[PDB]
């Protein structure tokens, strides 16, 4: 139900532009809470929660 991906590495800088987005610099390790959506995953980084593009990270 929450996808097969639990951990992922940021490939590119993602700039969060909205409150619900989880921004990161490339090389960050993201905990992936939900990977079921093909477009945007849900993650935890620095104890914050948010959405980020799935194609910006590598499992």
């Amino acid at each position: 139900p929450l996808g097969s991906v639990r951990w992922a590495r940021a490939l590119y800088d993602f700039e969060a532009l909205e409150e619900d987005e989880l921004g990161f610099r490339s090389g960050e390790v993201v905990e992936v809470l939900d990977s079921s959506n093909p477009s945007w995953w849900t993650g935890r980084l620095h104890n914050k929660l948010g959405l980020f593009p799935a194609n910006y990270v590598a499992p």
């Binding site: 490939l11 590119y12 800088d13 993602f14 909205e18 619900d20 987005e21 959506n37 477009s39 945007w40 849900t42 929660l49 948010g50 959405l51 593009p53 194609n55 910006y56």
Partner: peptide, 12 residues
């Protein structure tokens, strides 16, 4: 870096 499409963001 890939194009970003926010039209596909699901609710958090």
């Amino acid at each position: 870096a890939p194009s970003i499409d926010r039209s596909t963001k699901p609710p958090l």
